[PDB]
Design a protein around this ligand. Structure first.
Ligand SMILES: CC(=O)N[C@@H]1[C@@H](O)[C@H](O[C@@H]2O[C@H](CO)[C@@H](O[C@@H]3O[C@H](CO)[C@@H](O)[C@H](O[C@H]4O[C@H](CO)[C@@H](O)[C@H](O)[C@@H]4O[C@@H]4O[C@H](CO)[C@@H](O)[C@H](O)[C@H]4NC(C)=O)[C@@H]3O)[C@H](O)[C@H]2NC(C)=O)[C@@H](CO)O[C@H]1O
Ligand SMILES: Nc1nc2c(ncn2[C@@H]2O[C@H](COP(=O)(O)OP(=O)(O)O)[C@@H](O)[C@H]2O)c(=O)[nH]1
Ligand SMILES: Nc1nc2c(ncn2[C@@H]2O[C@H](COP(=O)(O)OP(=O)(O)O)[C@@H](O)[C@H]2O)c(=O)[nH]1
Lengths: 467, 467
């Protein structure tokens, strides 16, 4: 055992005890207070708590890094990335393209970039499970009629032709076993659904992923995003120039403010203060472990009027943003190459940030979060979503397993016994989540800490020929 | 890295986050409440917090045991105990007693048992540092004029005689370098003081002890307590019989209620409910990790009227206690052999408990806590004192090091800068401690989590010939 490891384990332990002592004392005092006297004492209480809590989260971070734990995790995560990218690349480049089994994917799903991009990942992940090379049809793409290679590398160097001796629409892996070329529709109309879908992960990688990553389901998705978004040279160069142009440096926290057409249809309007309370919080945590020269924020939004508002309200912050990109994201000009290049750039810098504050109901932020997983060993917790938990459109039921019992205090809560399977709908970021107790068919709230994630595994191919 | 180790570290991490989510939300709710509604909401809040907090402490326990950490810590602590006991036995049994260097200690210090026992421990630690054999004079002992061997084994098998060519009173290790037999007074009037005192530890054991034990200073003391209290055969049998008669079995929590002459002089009167809130708390913690057949408590007290009160007020508890021993602890019969054997038994069963709730102002509980350290790898946190932190009468200044800054919110608090040395006087068990900032000469309260223990080391002899 490590000297610093035990020191840290005990400092975290004792720090929690003192926190419990602190809580009990101040609450007993609070029960005897009223009005402003009550409200000021509660505010001072909250300030003191945040620092204490952050001291514990800092000791927890150090524990995750002490005694070579950080060095090992990066090497293993690196070995895992290399392995998958090696298998994907092998699958994507058969010797004889005319005789390879293929799966055709059409990019023109009726939605935005991140949603269309997730369609390709959904296509790619099933092509992986079926040992079929992915063929991506991207002509007449709404962001770029020139197609996929307007921005990114082709998904294959040897097999980009879709010809085959037999062709047909999706009907099942078994039924299509002797069909060379299979056309795959969007997940919304996929029947029958195969098991190669989120949030499951390859059975052969399950044990290694749990040791490294706090959310393997996102990591698995990120591996296909990592492959797809290989930039064309001019795009690679422009990212390199934008990085230098915007003075993009660390430490930096990424913020995605999705407004415009999303409001009133798939999400709500969130004031800028709802985002910045968590940015400031995180900078207070990082300050506990390093020197914060300047409080930097990369702001990605389709509201071009927001940057002036933000700079006005937070003058001690350095806001890094491309307002012309935000303007290009406008509804009247959203579906062009220039706007496409804009959102690609914004997502890149969001993914490169040290922390991500946004709304996961927007696919733009979910992509940045996914890419982030490829830049760090375990960046699963390096975010805060103002609404939805992480999800992938079309995923199988996101389930959890109750580990502690719960008796409802109100009719709006649901009971839980250890072992109950809970299908989570979301986290309210108030200590409570919302979901259904499948055993009872009741829906309602439950404490977010009394459940555990039910990790799903699928027997994927392992492509041993790629070594 | 171990799979379960990482799972636990992340679950501790997330549990703290969800606790932080829970706190902010419910506090925001509390600021808008009044009257009974306010007090009901705070009480329900505390119930939810205790369980949540205990769920985190349980995972922290598992972390201390995962991946063979429990087996290693148990093995290492065993080798350290055997090593020190091997050295002590070597020092205490020279071949030629007539030529050995000796240090004479008289047991009849004017105080109770635990205080007199600490006198011998204080004598023993200095004899150890000076490479002198301890000769214990225990005639006219107030609990047993027959002497030390009425209950315990002699401290030496070869050298119990005090003869020597030169004798003198204590005057310094340097001045006594050629004085064979040195007489040592009580610490309260000791001049000059040697460095072989609590709460310092041998320089050669610092790294190994910090790695294993959460409070090395107590472990060091416990090694001398362990040696002294080696029971005579008839005493060993009596304990074995009492264990069987009292149905002493696990799980069990030890409770020491010191009253009578202590109240109003060296401590305060504490109702039984103040003790049982922490007993119940821990049984709620233990239930999270094991099957708790029955909530057992071993009650040691000098108030013979207390046992019936407890049985009446807590009918769901099984109280193990010998009331005739409590009667023997009365002021008119305190200093007899029958009473002496009684308190020895009480301390034994207190030390054997899985947790110790008491007042550390009573030397009776400090001995049980020390002995407890010899029964487990790291039992440093297996206690709760209603008043004083751990201390050893005559210790050098117990100092701490501030790790986080603090700005006083009231005049009753003191400021701290990181690295400042703070002389601790005690912990108020409410999130605040009390002490003096030696850099400023200011005394007052400060957050208990912003400080770190300054572990002190002393170059003791190592007795390499004992191998
Ligand atoms: C000549 C002779 O033979 N002398 C012996 C003594 O050696 C023998 O033992 C001595 O007993 C005393 C008192 O039991 C003990 O003193 C303590 O030393 C502690 C360490 O420095 C110190 O912290 C203690 O002070 C607390 O308690 C006293 C009251 O006893 C209060 O007045 C103080 O304010 C302290 O109160 C604590 O304060 C903190 C912070 O405010 C609180 O967190 C905590 O809850 C408070 N606790 C209480 C109970 O209020 C105390 O001064 C000696 O260490 C000890 N010495 C030795 C060598 O054993 C004595 C035993 O009866 O008999 C004499 O004949
Ligand atoms: N450049 C840029 N474009 C954005 C931003 N937010 C939204 N957009 C545009 O709006 C589209 C929304 O499509 P989508 O990726 O499916 O995300 P969602 O509809 O918010 O879930 C994006 O693809 C962009 O074209 C932004 O912050 N920056
Ligand atoms: N048998 C028994 N005796 C006790 C108990 N509590 C106190 N006493 C007696 O009271 C004395 C107190 O002396 P001491 O050990 O120096 O500790 P302190 O005065 O409580 O700090 C003890 O030595 C016992 O003789 C108890 O729980 N059981």
């Amino acid at each position: 055992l490590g000297k610093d490891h035990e020191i840290l384990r005990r400092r975290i332990e004792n720090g929690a005890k003192e926190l419990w002592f602190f809580l009990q004392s101040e609450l007993k005092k609070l029960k005897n207070l009223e009005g402003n006297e009550l409200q000021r004492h509660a505010d001072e209480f909250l300030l003191d708590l945040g620092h204490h809590e952050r001291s514990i989260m800092t000791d927890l971070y150090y524990l995750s890094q002490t005694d070579g734990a950080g060095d090992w995790r990066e090497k293993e995560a690196k070995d895992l990335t290399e392995l998958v990218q090696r298998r994907i690349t092998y699958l994507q480049n058969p010797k004889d393209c005319s005789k390879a089994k293929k799966l055709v994917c059409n990019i023109n799903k009726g939605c935005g970039y991140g949603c269309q991009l997730h369609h390709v990942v959904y296509c790619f992940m099933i092509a992986y499970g079926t040992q079929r090379t992915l063929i991506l049809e991207s002509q007449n793409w709404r962001y770029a009629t020139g197609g996929w290679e307007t921005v990114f590398r082709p998904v294959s160097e040897t097999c980009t032709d879709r010809s085959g001796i037999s062709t047909g629409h999706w009907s099942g892996e078994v039924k299509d076993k002797n069909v060379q070329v299979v056309e795959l529709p969007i997940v919304d109309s996929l029947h029958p659904r195969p098991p190669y879908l989120p949030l499951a992960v390859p059975e052969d990688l399950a044990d290694r992923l749990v040791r490294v990553h706090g959310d393997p389901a996102v990591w698995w998705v990120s591996q296909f995003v990592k492959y797809l978004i290989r930039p064309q040279p001019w795009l690679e160069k422009e990212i390199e120039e934008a990085t230098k142009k915007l003075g993009f440096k660390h430490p930096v926290i990424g913020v995605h403010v999705r407004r415009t057409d999303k409001v009133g249809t798939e999400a709500a309007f969130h004031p800028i203060e709802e985002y910045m309370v968590h940015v400031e919080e995180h900078f207070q945590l990082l300050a506990r472990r390093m020197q914060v020269d300047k409080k930097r924020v990369y702001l990605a939004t389709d509201d071009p009027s927001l940057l002036k508002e933000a700079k006005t309200k937070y003058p001690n912050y350095e806001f890094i943003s491309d307002n012309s990109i935000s303007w290009s994201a406008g509804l009247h000009n959203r579906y062009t190459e220039n706007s496409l290049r804009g959102v690609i750039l914004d997502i890149h810098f969001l993914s490169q940030a040290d922390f991500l504050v946004c709304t996961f109901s927007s696919q733009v932020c979910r992509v940045a979060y996914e890419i982030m997983q490829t830049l760090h060993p375990d960046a699963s917790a390096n975010f805060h979503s103002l609404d939805d938990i992480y999800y992938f459109g079309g995923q199988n039921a996101h389930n959890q397993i109750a580990i502690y019992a719960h008796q409802p205090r109100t009719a709006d809560e649901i009971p839980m016994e250890p072992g109950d399977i809970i299908g989570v709908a979301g986290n309210h970021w108030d200590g409570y989540s919302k979901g259904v107790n499948r055993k009872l068919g009741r829906t309602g709230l439950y404490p977010s800490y009394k459940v555990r994630e039910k990790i799903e595994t699928v027997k994927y191919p392992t492509y041993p020929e790629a070594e």
